[PDB]
Enzyme design. Structure first.
Site, PDB file in Angstrom:
ATOM      1  N   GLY A  43      23.948  27.429   6.426  1.00  0.00           N
ATOM      2  CA  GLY A  43      24.300  26.165   7.038  1.00  0.00           C
ATOM      3  C   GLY A  43      24.442  25.158   5.921  1.00  0.00           C
ATOM      4  O   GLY A  43      24.366  25.527   4.750  1.00  0.00           O
ATOM      5  N   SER A  46      20.633  24.894   4.727  1.00  0.00           N
ATOM      6  CA  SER A  46      19.868  26.054   4.289  1.00  0.00           C
ATOM      7  C   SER A  46      20.597  27.388   4.353  1.00  0.00           C
ATOM      8  O   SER A  46      21.702  27.500   4.890  1.00  0.00           O
ATOM      9  CB  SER A  46      18.607  26.177   5.137  1.00  0.00           C
ATOM     10  OG  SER A  46      18.949  26.488   6.480  1.00  0.00           O
ATOM     11  N   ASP A 151      20.906  18.500  18.923  1.00  0.00           N
ATOM     12  CA  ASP A 151      21.863  19.411  18.301  1.00  0.00           C
ATOM     13  C   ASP A 151      21.997  20.686  19.120  1.00  0.00           C
ATOM     14  O   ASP A 151      22.035  21.788  18.585  1.00  0.00           O
ATOM     15  CB  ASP A 151      21.469  19.738  16.857  1.00  0.00           C
ATOM     16  CG  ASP A 151      22.610  20.402  16.071  1.00  0.00           C
ATOM     17  OD1 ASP A 151      23.789  20.263  16.475  1.00  0.00           O
ATOM     18  OD2 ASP A 151      22.327  21.043  15.039  1.00  0.00           O
TER      19      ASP A 151
HETATM   20  N1  LIG Z   1      14.966  29.692  13.729  1.00  0.00           N
HETATM   21  C1  LIG Z   1      15.460  30.700  14.020  1.00  0.00           C
HETATM   22  C2  LIG Z   1      15.977  32.007  14.288  1.00  0.00           C
HETATM   23  C3  LIG Z   1      15.332  33.045  14.986  1.00  0.00           C
HETATM   24  N2  LIG Z   1      16.105  34.162  14.936  1.00  0.00           N
HETATM   25  N3  LIG Z   1      17.234  33.876  14.226  1.00  0.00           N
HETATM   26  C4  LIG Z   1      18.255  34.652  13.914  1.00  0.00           C
HETATM   27  N4  LIG Z   1      18.230  35.948  14.303  1.00  0.00           N
HETATM   28  C5  LIG Z   1      19.327  36.864  14.002  1.00  0.00           C
HETATM   29  C6  LIG Z   1      19.204  37.442  12.592  1.00  0.00           C
HETATM   30  C7  LIG Z   1      20.402  38.331  12.345  1.00  0.00           C
HETATM   31  C8  LIG Z   1      20.392  39.698  12.005  1.00  0.00           C
HETATM   32  N5  LIG Z   1      21.699  40.056  11.887  1.00  0.00           N
HETATM   33  C9  LIG Z   1      22.473  38.962  12.141  1.00  0.00           C
HETATM   34  N6  LIG Z   1      21.678  37.894  12.425  1.00  0.00           N
HETATM   35  N7  LIG Z   1      19.283  34.191  13.209  1.00  0.00           N
HETATM   36  C10 LIG Z   1      19.254  32.921  12.822  1.00  0.00           C
HETATM   37  N8  LIG Z   1      20.360  32.540  12.130  1.00  0.00           N
HETATM   38  C11 LIG Z   1      20.719  31.299  11.710  1.00  0.00           C
HETATM   39  C12 LIG Z   1      21.805  31.219  10.841  1.00  0.00           C
HETATM   40  C13 LIG Z   1      22.233  29.983  10.358  1.00  0.00           C
HETATM   41  C14 LIG Z   1      21.582  28.812  10.741  1.00  0.00           C
HETATM   42  C15 LIG Z   1      20.502  28.877  11.617  1.00  0.00           C
HETATM   43  C16 LIG Z   1      20.080  30.116  12.093  1.00  0.00           C
HETATM   44  N9  LIG Z   1      18.250  32.090  13.098  1.00  0.00           N
HETATM   45  C17 LIG Z   1      17.219  32.576  13.812  1.00  0.00           C
END
Ligand SMILES: N#Cc1cnn2c(NCCc3cnc[nH]3)nc(Nc3ccccc3)nc12
EC number: 2.7.11.1
Length: 328
Positions: A43, A46, A151
């Site tokens: 993002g 982060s 958001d």
């Molecule tokens: N808190 C939380 C949070 C909890 N799970 N989570 C996940 N889980 C999926 C992980 C995954 C495994 N293969 C693909 N994705 N992704 C993101 N992603 C995220 C990305 C960018 C910005 C914010 C969140 N944030 C979170």
């Protein structure tokens, strides 16, 4: 002078430490307790990685933050701690930092999410009602705790479709609601920004999240992602005006004594209100019932004070089956 119609005095009655996030003293955990398994996203604030707790060998999400102000990060931490445990609120497990660079990382519970771009197209009518109901629980909860998410959008709603578990994440833009306070309108993602942000009405409240939810909902039932596709903040209001009509906008503006910038007023122009059914087609027909339209309509109102509260939304007949199912 606008104020929330519900939960207006939550922070007034609670101890000052509850909302005085700047007074927070961060307790750093052990950085070595968590290992990066693989980057899963990013993002503007982060980089996100799937990680593992070396102690219990359980999965987690590691959010490595880019340079951020002390005030800024304490706000997110305090809000997460205040809400941790609430219905469908993502859990903040730990907070750590790199000694040399001072780069902080937030450790969150792991959700086996499926990219909404791929997920939403497979959701059945019932799935939509079910997941939206679940998201509502999270919103009524944070609002009841005196907090605005600010958001709400698909990217901030993790969904494990297999387990049918949902979590509202990324509280970095969240803020405590205090009656009469003027907030920064530069929040939420453009396609989900409420009219109040677009016309610079700063004393907004929890109701902002309900407009965002409405946008998300409209996108799902009409299968148009995003529903209001604006190019910039000015165009975003125009796209809204072309659907809800300019009469409603004008009335809204007059009610709150707001005057649009000359350039913006020019771009908006004049538009008639377009019935919701005009957006129905063969691709979404199995999702645009009268109950869905009625519900959407009561969410997407220019006047934030007119919108359904999260609590009200949950009781709308549109969710009657989900409720009955839950009461079993
Ligand atoms: N808190 C939380 C949070 C909890 N799970 N989570 C996940 N889980 C999926 C992980 C995954 C495994 N293969 C693909 N994705 N992704 C993101 N992603 C995220 C990305 C960018 C910005 C914010 C969140 N944030 C979170």
């Amino acid at each position: 002078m606008s104020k929330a119609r519900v939960y207006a005095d939550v922070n007034v009655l609670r101890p000052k430490e509850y909302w005085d996030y700047e007074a927070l003293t961060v307790q750093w955990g052990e950085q070595d307790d968590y290992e990066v398994v693989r980057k899963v996203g990013r993002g503007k604030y982060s980089e996100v990685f799937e990680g593992i707790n070396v102690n219990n060998n359980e999965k987690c999400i590691i959010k490595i933050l880019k340079p951020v102000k002390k005030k800024k990060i304490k706000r997110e931490i305090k809000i997460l701690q205040n809400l941790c445990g609430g219905p469908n609120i993502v859990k903040l497990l730990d907070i750590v930092r790199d000694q040399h660079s001072k780069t902080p990382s937030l450790i969150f519970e792991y959700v086996n999410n499926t990219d909404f771009k791929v997920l939403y197209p497979t959701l059945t009518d019932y799935d939509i009602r079910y997941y939206i109901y679940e998201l509502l629980k999270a919103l009524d909860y944070c609002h009841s705790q005196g907090i605005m998410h600010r958001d709400v959008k698909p990217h901030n709603v993790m969904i494990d479709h297999e387990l049918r578990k949902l979590r509202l994440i990324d509280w970095g833009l969240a803020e405590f609601y205090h009656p009469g306070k003027e907030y920064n309108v530069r929040v939420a993602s453009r396609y989900f920004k409420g009219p109040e942000l677009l016309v610079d009405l700063q004393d907004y409240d929890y109701s902002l999240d309900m407009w965002s939810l409405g946008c998300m909902f409209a996108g799902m039932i009409f299968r148009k992602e995003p529903f209001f596709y604006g190019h910039d903040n000015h165009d975003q209001l125009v796209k809204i005006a072309k659907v809800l009509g300019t009469d409603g906008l004008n009335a809204y503006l007059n009610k709150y004594r707001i005057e649009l910038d000359p350039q913006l007023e020019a771009l908006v122009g004049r538009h008639s209100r377009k019935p919701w059914l005009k957006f129905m087609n063969a691709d979404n027909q199995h999702l645009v019932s009268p109950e869905a339209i009625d519900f959407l309509d009561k969410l997407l109102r220019y006047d934030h004070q007119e919108r359904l509260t999260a609590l009200e939304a949950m009781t709308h007949p549109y969710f009657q089956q989900v409720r009955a199912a839950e009461n079993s």
